[PDB]
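Repro case for the chain-ordering regression, as requested:
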Amino acid sequence: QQEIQQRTSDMLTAATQLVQDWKQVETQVYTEGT
Amino acid sequence: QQEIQQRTSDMLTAATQLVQDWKQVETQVYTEGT
Amino acid sequence: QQEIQQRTSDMLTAATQLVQDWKQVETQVYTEGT
Amino acid sequence: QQEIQQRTSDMLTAATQLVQDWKQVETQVYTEGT
Amino acid sequence: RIIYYIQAVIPGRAWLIGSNGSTLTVREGSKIPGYGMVKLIDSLQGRILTSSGQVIKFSQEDS
Amino acid sequence: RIIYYIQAVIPGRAWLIGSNGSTLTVREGSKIPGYGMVKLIDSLQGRILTSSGQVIKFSQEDS
Amino acid sequence: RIIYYIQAVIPGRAWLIGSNGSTLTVREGSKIPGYGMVKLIDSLQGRILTSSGQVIKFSQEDS
Amino acid sequence: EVIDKKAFKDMTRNLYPLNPEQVVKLKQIYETSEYAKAATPGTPPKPTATSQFVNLSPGSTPPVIRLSQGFVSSLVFLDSTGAPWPIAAYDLGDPSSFNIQWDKTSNTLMIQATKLYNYGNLAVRLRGLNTPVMLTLIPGQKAVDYRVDLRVQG
Amino acid sequence: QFVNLSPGSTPPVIRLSQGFVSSLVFLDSTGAPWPIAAYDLGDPSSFNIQWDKTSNTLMIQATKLYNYGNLAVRLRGLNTPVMLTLIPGQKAVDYRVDLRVQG
Amino acid sequence: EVIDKKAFKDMTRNLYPLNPEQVVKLKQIYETSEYAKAATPGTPPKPTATS
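-- result from build under test --
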């Protein structure tokens, strides 16, 4: 059943990839000018 | 059957080359004057 | 039937020749005056 | 009959010599006067 | 009557504008005025079905 | 009537200008004044096919 | 009638100048008065065939 | 001299191994491939402009603006008489989704959608207004607003 | 072409040829020049432009193959910027367009 | 000449394994994945002003 474990390997890499896609949030920017 | 897996390899290399051709975003540019 | 593929490789050199021989483009040459 | 490719060898070297002779074109010169 | 158009559509929430120019926004669970209740909203094909059986979609002039 | 000249032929879009100078864009799913409804927008050969069965083309002068 | 001559020959189009000073460009599918419809275009040797069995080429002086 | 004739034949076939017809064939192949690359699946959005009357009622809803990636929209802000009200300052969330060029003493905003579909919010403080105006910008629809004019209540 | 300022009016489109210079001099309803205060243009990778900071004339170069973009131009006496869509890859190329403002 | 035609076909195939329609449909797959990535679960909230 090696297809099972290689499938879990690649989808776990993809899951960690989407974790580092989603765990960050950028901030605001307030701009003032006269 | 036994010769199609190398056919797979050239497909993805062109595909992975193509896959970052859309991710970039061109910056708008503004020019002043007098 | 065994000499097409080595002959094909020479075409591939000309194939990869023309893409960089075509898709490059130089920009304008604007001239001022007074 | 080994004479087939030796006459090819000196053929292409002058041929590769001759093609780039037509390739280069120098730009013209200009001279003012006062 | 007042005819609504889809001014915005994502999965989940929808934004609509009356023929007068009014503003509204709804989800699948809400009471839609003049149409009863919201049956089904799909971001695919841009159609909203109501409990009155009436369907609200894009402007055909502005699609 | 309106004699539409092609301005931009692309997959999914169409750009036309009539004989009276009015300019507009249209899509595949849309109507057409003076020709009914839009049957086919063809990226190939610069063809616009109507539901009433007509072809829209360039000016012969303006190729 | 109006005498046309070639000022430029390319693949794709053709460039004709009349004897009066009126010039234009032509494609494969088009018409010209006094010669008819362009049945074929020869990019080689600067020859343009038409429907009336007539070939427009360069001038005798422009040679 | 047939030896030299065959020599000329083979030096020709190795000096120019590529046919001119094959050159034109691969050129059309290049054009077809790059046209498929630059082609966008689905239909492109309809380019349009709008002029909206903003309701600043506390019980009301904030305005909603459709957008699309890779295009710049101009939003102008005038009073109910239509006179050009300048813009004092703003506060924008999600910098990586919406590119923005702001002329500091103007009345119009140029907004470019940096990301594809994720939506954002923006607050703008005007000159004499004690209360800022907040709007939602949502990219990725079949309508692209090229220019939006905003008639405010005040 | 004469442009129009109504929101329902469709924005004008310009056919383009790659690498060939397009000259655009902007004139009013009366035909007099209306000088350009500023401009904004997305995708410099697809559109190349020289623009002198005095005249109402734009030198436009289509850099890419089929990428269409938008252009906004603020004139010396116009509050509303003029916004047009330029697309390359048509069977004609406008060398020069005479565009007329309402104002 | 069949050697030449086979060589040109093989060079074309090895140059571009992907057909243009395959390129377009994989671009469709890519942008569908982008829509999925931008998709947010649950009910999105409602903006409002309060006094």
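Ordering looks correct now. The longest strand of chain B covers residues 29-31.
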